Amino acid sequence: QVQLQESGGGLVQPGGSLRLSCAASGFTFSNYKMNWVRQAPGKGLEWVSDISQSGASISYTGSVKGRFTISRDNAKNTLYLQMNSLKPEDTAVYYCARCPAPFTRDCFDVTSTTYAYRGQGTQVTVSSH
Amino acid sequence: QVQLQESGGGLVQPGGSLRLSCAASGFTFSNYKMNWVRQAPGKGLEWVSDISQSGASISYTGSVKGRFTISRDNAKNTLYLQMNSLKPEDTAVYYCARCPAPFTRDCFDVTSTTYAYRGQGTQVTVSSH
Amino acid sequence: ELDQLRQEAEQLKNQIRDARKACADATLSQITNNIDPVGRIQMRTRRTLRGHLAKIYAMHWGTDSRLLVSASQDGKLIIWDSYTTNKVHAIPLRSSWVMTCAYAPSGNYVACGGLDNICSIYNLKTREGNVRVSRELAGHTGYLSCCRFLDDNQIVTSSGDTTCALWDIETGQQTTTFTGHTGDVMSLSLAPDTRLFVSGACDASAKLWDVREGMCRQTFTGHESDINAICFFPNGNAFATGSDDATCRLFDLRADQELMTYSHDNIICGITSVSFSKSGRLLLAGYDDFNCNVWDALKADRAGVLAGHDNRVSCLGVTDDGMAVATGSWDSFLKIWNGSS
Amino acid sequence: ELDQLRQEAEQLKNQIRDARKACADATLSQITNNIDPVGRIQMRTRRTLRGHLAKIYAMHWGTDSRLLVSASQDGKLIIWDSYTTNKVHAIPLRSSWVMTCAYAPSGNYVACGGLDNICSIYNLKTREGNVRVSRELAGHTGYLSCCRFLDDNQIVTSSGDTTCALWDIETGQQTTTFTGHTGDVMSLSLAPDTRLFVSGACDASAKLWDVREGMCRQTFTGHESDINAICFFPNGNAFATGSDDATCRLFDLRADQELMTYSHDNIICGITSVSFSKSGRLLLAGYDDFNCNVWDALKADRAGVLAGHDNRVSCLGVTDDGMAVATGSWDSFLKIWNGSS
C-alpha cells in the first residue's frame, strides 16, 4: 500500500527555522518524482516545490524561493523541506505528494482535492507570542 | 490622550470560547460609538462588529453572525467581544476602534491603514495542536 | 473522533496483513519449478482491419468468435467480420469521444460510452436494417470508462467518478450502485458465472463486487500506480491486473493476496490491456511500448512478443474458443494474431 | 525591539505628564474670579456681501483692514471692499474645489489651494490690470488645507498628508518640511513676530514648529476629536484650538499644557473657525450649528451669540485693528459684524 507520513511542524516563532520530514513506504522512492503542497486556512491547495528523481532538478514558487530548501534521500526513502525565515502568512497545512506515474516529468493532478497519492500532512503555524 | 488597550487572545483550540476586553481612557466612552476590526495574515483590515452608544443597536458581518457577542459597559468604560465556536480561519489581529465623531451614526475611515483612534490590538490564533 | 477511527482502521489493516502473511504457505513460482516451460511462441497477423479514421480505443469479441465490435474516436462504431474481413455495420456515434464498447452475449445489442458520460446502446434486431439508439443511460457524472453485458436487460457500467452501476435496460435506471473506490474506475471483468465482478481503479487497488447484494467482498492493494486493465481467470478464481508501473500481478480471491508478479527490468512503459487464454496458461498483456507481450502465467517468462502496431496497443481481446487474438492500437488498425505450427 | 522602544515612549510620556502636573500651580478660572465680567455683547450685521455662487470655505483679511479675500467652491476668488461693498477682483480659479485662501501682508500677492494639491499664487501688481497665476506649487500629495503668508517670498503651507511645507516663491521649491503629524493638518496660525507657527491636525493634537530650524518644539494633546481651527493669542504666548467635540481649549506655550476649556452642555455640534480679538479678551468661535459664539477667554462665559447665517459658519476672521468681524458660511454670504454702543 502506498502511504506517506509527514513529521515536524507545530508552533514556530516568525523568522525561525524548521524541518519537515516525509517518510514514504510501499513503492520505489527513487523512481517517483516528489512534490510539496500546502493548504492555507480558508484557501485552496497551492504547489510549493518539486524535486526530480535524482535531485538534479529543483523548482520553487515565487513566495518561497530562497526561503525553503528541498532535498531527498533515496537510501533512507525520505523527503525533506528545510524552512527558515518564516513569516506569519506562511501558516498552512503541508502535504507530501508524489507524481502519479514513474519515469515522467509531468504531474497533472497533484494539487487536487481528491488526490490519492499524498500524505495526511502536518500543521505549521507561524504566530508570534 | 485617547488610548485604547486590548486584552485577551493567544492560542485557542478550534470550537472553544474566548473573551476580548478593550479598555478606553482619555475620552467619554458613553458618547462615542465603538467598533471591532480584524486583520487576517496577509490580508487587509475588515470590519467585524459595531455597537451604538447605548447598545440598543448592534450589527455583525456575515462571517461572524451568531458566533460573536459584542457588549459595552459605560460605567466601567470598557468594550467586550465574546467569541465562541472559533474556526481555524478566524485567526487574525483584532483592533478596538472608535468612530471618530461624537453623537454620530456614521464613521468613515475606521477600517483605514493609518487610523489614529484605534488600539494596538492583540493576536488570536485558532490552531489545533 | 477522527484519531480513534483512524487508529482502529490502521489496526484493521495490520490484522488483515497478518492474516495474509499467515496463509502464505509458499510461493507460486516455487511450486511451478517442476513444470515444462511453455517456450517461444510465434504468432502471425492473419487479418488486418482498416477503415477507422481516428485511433481505436476499445473493442469486444462476440460469443460466436465471428463478429467483433470496435470503437474509434472519430465517432464510428464498426462491426467487423474476422473471417472474410467484411464490415457488417458502421454506427455513427452521437459523441465522437468514445472510450469503451461492449458486445452483448446474444449479439442483439451493442453498448458504448465515452466522455459524454452517456451509455448508448443500439439494437441490431431491427427488421428495416437501420441501426438506432435503443436506449440511453445518463446517471454518471464522470467519464464513461468501461461497460460489460450481463444479459439482454442488465448491464454493468464503470465511470470515472469512482462509482460502478448496474442498469436495467427496460426501465433505464440504476438498479444497484457500487461506491467504494477512491479513484477513477478504469475497467472491470465479468466472472464466467456472471455472479461477481472485480474492478480496477486509479487508487492502485482492485475491489470485488457482488452483483446481487451490491457490497464489496475483497480489496487487493499490491500495485504502485494506476491500474488500467483487469481480466478474470478462465476458472474464475483469480484475475490478472495491469498498471502503469510496467508490472502485471495475479491475484487469487481465495488466498486474498497476490500470487505472482510479471515484471521486466527492460520494460518501463505502462500497460493498457490484459487478457488470458482459454486454458489460462498464457497472459497476453498489451504494453504502451508499441507492442504486446505474451507472458506465462505460471513461470513469469516472456513466452512471445507481438510487435505489429505503429502506436500503443489500446485494447486486446481473445476469442471465447481462443482461436485468435485481436489487438487494436492508436494507428487506426486492428490486427488479428493466430498461432502457427 | 519594538517593546523596548514602546515602553520607553510610555515612560517618557509619563514623565511629561508628571512635569505638567508638577507645574500646575493653580487654575486660570480660579485666579480670574476677581475680574469684572465682560457682559452681554450685541453685534449687528453692518455689511452683507453677496455674489458668490457656491459655499464659502475660507477668507482672509488684509493688513489695512480694508480689502478681504474670499474663496468659494464654484471656482471664484473675490476680493471685497469692506467699507463700500465694492468688488475689486474676481479670480476664476483653475480648480473649482478650494479649501483655503490667504492675503499677503503687503497685498501684492494672494494665495489659494484646494483638493488639487496645488497652491496657486496670483500677483496683483500687473500694470495691465489683468490678474494671472504668478506661481504654482506642487509638492503635496494630500489635499491642501491651509496656507499663510510670511512675506512676499516665503509662504507656509498645510496639506492633508500630515505634512507642512515652507515654500520659496522665487524658486518654487520647498525650503523646509515639517513631518511630525499622524493626521491631516487642518489649519495653522502664524505668530505675530513670524518666528513660530502652530498647526492642528486630525490626531487631536497641536504641534509648535520652528520656521528656521524646521523642528517641532512642543506638542499639546488635550482634545478628544479632530481639531479644525487654531489661532494665536495676540501676545503670541498662547493659542486657542477648536475641535469637533464642541469644545474650545486654550493652550499656553510656557506652561506646556491647557489652561481653560470653553464647553457648554447644550452645544453638541462641531467647531469650524476660531479667532481672538485685538486685546485677546474675547474668543469668537464659529460653530457648526448655523451660528457663531463669542466666549470670554478669562471667564469661560458666552459673551454673545451671532446668528445671522443660513448654514454652518465655515470661516471667521477679525481685523488687525479689531473694528469688525467677518464670518463666511455655506450660504454664499459674507456677514460683517461690528459692536454698537
In short:
The structure is cut from a larger assembly and holds 2 copies of chain A (129 residues) and 2 copies of chain C (341 residues). Chain A is mostly beta strands. Chain A has strands at residues 3-7, 10-12, 17-25, 34-39, 45-51, 58-60, 68-73, 78-84, 92-98, 122-126.
Question: Can you describe this structure?
Answer:
- The structure is cut from a larger assembly and holds 2 copies of chain A (about 130 residues) and 2 copies of chain C (about 350 residues).
- Chain A has about 130 residues and is mostly beta strands.
- Helices cover about 0% and strands about 45% of the residues of chain A.
- Chain C is about 5% helix and about 50% strand.
- In chain C, the strands form 7 sheets. Chain C has a 4-stranded antiparallel sheet, with no helix packed on it. In chain C, strands 2-3-4-5 form a 4-stranded antiparallel sheet, with no helix packed on it.
- Chain C is mainly beta and about 350 residues long.
- Chain C has a single domain (about 1-340), classed as Methylamine Dehydrogenase, Chain H (7 Propeller), CATH 2.130.10.10.
- The interface of A and C includes residues 100 and 103 of A.
Biggest sheet strand line-up of chain A:
2-10-9-4-5-6
In which range does the helix fraction of chain A lie? under 10%
Instruction: Give the proportion of residues in helices of chain C.
Output: under 10%
Classification by helices and strands of chain A:
mainly beta
Total domain modules of chain A: 1
In terms of structural class, how would the helical and strand content of chain C be classed? mainly beta
- Which fold name is given in CATH as the topology of chain A? Immunoglobulin-like
- Quaternary structure state of the chains depicted: part of a larger assembly
CATH superfamily of chain C: YVTN repeat-like/Quinoprotein amine dehydrogenase
Q: What is the annotated CATH architecture of chain C?
A: 7 Propeller
Number of helices of chain C: 2
